[PDB]
Write a protein that binds this ligand. Structure first.
Ligand code: PIE
Ligand code: PIE
Ligand code: FE
Ligand code: FE
Lengths: 309, 309
């Protein structure tokens, strides 16, 4: 079933997409298109992919884009994690060491969250009778432990049902999304609720493909972070919580050593009173170490389309 | 910038998408996913594709799917034509010869058009003062010239502005879309209007990428055909009209020898009266030769999602 070799494929892709050019071309877009189309044609030949198969593939991609699920598909196939593996290797070749490890953004960041200094309450209290209270705190430092004041700590996470605000229109706008600027001691504190892990929408396109692959679409509980400061490399990270069934079986492959936190239980009446609470809560420490931005450093920032509100 | 070789890539794709499988897997979908993801990761390494670039690519695909333009993109990059090049080579290796040549379907077929025997008027007359009348006629035969009665001739084409019904909601439903069953003499006749060639939606995603490639998004005038009959291989084809600026410069590469027709001019008062018209018209002959369906023959039918009404 090999009807064309790669030479013949390359000649056809050139005739159709390069020889037809008139006037100015974006050379990078041209290069990438030619490469990816040649690779697709070769895979069609090697695997003898039939026209009905190609159309099913394109229809699936159309449906995924219509459901706004291609971000989730990038995560679940491991493409998003792969970009981080490449970034870590680039940084190693640059001699960049130290710093809290990176991991994936995921597709659910929303720009425009409430900003405050040193402290934020993340939740609206609508789940207070059905989920544990969580306090998260940490210090943001450079690699020698010097505190960083005014670092921008952006956090977002799921509610007690595994749902995120903005996407879940039942939640108040920006629920469980805050920006916290570190205080004079490099500290941030968030008063919030325990996140639960979650799966892909069960009738959606991402889970439809995972089902064909025999795979689950679940993530362990986690809290997402962007951390930035003048003079420092921007960090995209998370923590995961020890004890989760899916901790080392995340469908998006985001868990790493260095990013697992233990949720401690605080039942002590004195400490509860000190925090102005009425019941036991969970506490997580998550300190963040940022690497100073050097002239030689590859960028740690990523341009990506993100929701805003 | 090579951070991973293909061995390392293959091992990662396997860890993420194969080792994670539990219970039954669709082996074909698994095979194709593993191949395409490995090829994507390798192209990312070879071309040093940055995360911002990957996200732009996925955002473009999302936007294309939302605008229902991935079919048009498949046509414009030459993927749709490439499937026909493969089908023609498969048929040659099967010893299938003769028959009117195939070409691309395009993305604008709609199922459920009015059916009639031997004759159809395709247009609603709403453009009668602004476009030329066209009569199309032909005989459908086997490869030795024997007529075929009751062959299903499905035709669709653009109006005087280059727009298709269903997609252009201003047109009456099924305007310029008919199914004509061949009569006792193997004949079909369509009374219609001259199609004009057309381009991609100028502010749409397909033209946005073509612009980066320095390419136009125009097709020459044409009329699309499905032809089918019991005992015969289904045919997807078109004719193009001689004289079109874009005849041999179609952005979808669909023009072929054997499928260019000449539009003759009929100004003769006697002939005009015979056809029950009042003014000169254009006439096209387009005969169709179908190949008999043999046990050895590869399928000439393609499963594809198509609009219906
Ligand atoms: C550009 C790539 C090349 C494309 C062009 C070449 C692609 C070639 C693909 C060959 C496919 C083999 C199919 C064999 C038989 C199919 C039978 C079938 O059941 O059809 C469908 C299966 O077809 C697929 O899902 C294939 C998609 C894989 C391609 C994308 C991954 C590529 C990886 C990397 C590239 C970068 C990709 C980017 C990474 C983010 C079933 O539908 P569905 O239940 O899976 O989803 C269903 C579904 O389809 C419903 O219609 C929908 O309503 C519902 O919501 C959804 O859940
Ligand atoms: C799965 C493939 C891998 C993907 C994952 C890997 C992809 C890697 C791609 C790298 C891209 C290089 C970009 C370099 C710099 C980008 C700058 C820029 O201006 O961004 C944009 C350019 O990015 C692209 O268009 C790249 C798309 C190519 C990928 C698809 C073809 C693959 C071929 C075969 C595979 C089968 C494909 C199937 C064939 C059908 C500009 O936006 P736009 O004006 O082109 O369109 C605009 C636009 O983007 C607007 O936002 C929108 O509103 C408007 O309508 C639209 O017109
Ligand atoms: Fe998340
Ligand atoms: Fe057309």
């Amino acid at each position: 079933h090999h009807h064309h070799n790669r030479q013949q494929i390359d000649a056809l892709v050139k005739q159709m997409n390069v020889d037809t050019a008139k006037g100015p071309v974006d050379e990078r877009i041209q290069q990438v298109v030619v490469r990816l189309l040649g690779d697709l044609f070769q895979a069609i030949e090697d695997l003898d992919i039939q026209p009905s198969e190609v159309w099913k593939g394109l229809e699936y991609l159309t449906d995924a884009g219509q459901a706004n699920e291609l971000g989730a598909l990038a995560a679940g196939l491991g493409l998003e994690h792969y970009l981080d593996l490449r970034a870590d290797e680039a940084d190693a070749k640059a001699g960049i060491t130290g710093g809290t490890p990176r991991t994936i953004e995921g597709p659910l960041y929303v720009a425009g969250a409430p900003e405050s200094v040193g402290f934020a309450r993340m939740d609206d209290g609508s789940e207070s009778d059905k989920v544990d209270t969580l306090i998260i705190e940490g210090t943001v430092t450079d690699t020698e432990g010097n505190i960083i004041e005014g670092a921008k700590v952006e956090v977002w996470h799921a509610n007690s049902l595994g749902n995120y605000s903005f996407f879940d229109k039942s939640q108040s706008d920006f629920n469980l999304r805050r920006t916290i600027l570190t205080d004079v001691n490099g500290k941030y504190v968030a008063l919030t609720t325990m996140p639960v892990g979650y799966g892909c929408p069960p009738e959606g396109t991402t889970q439809a493909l995972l089902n064909k692959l025999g795979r689950h679409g679940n993530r362990p509980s986690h809290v997402h972070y962007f951390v930035s400061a003048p003079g420092y490399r921007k960090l995209t990270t998370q923590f995961n919580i020890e004890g989760d069934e899916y901790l080392w079986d995340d469908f998006a492959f985001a868990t790493r050593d260095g990013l697992v936190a233990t949720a401690t239980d605080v039942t002590d009446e004195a400490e509860i009173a000190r925090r102005e609470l009425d019941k036991p809560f969970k506490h997580i420490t998550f300190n963040v170490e940022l690497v100073k931005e050097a002239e030689a450093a590859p960028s740690s920032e990523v341009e990506r389309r993100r929701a805003s509100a």
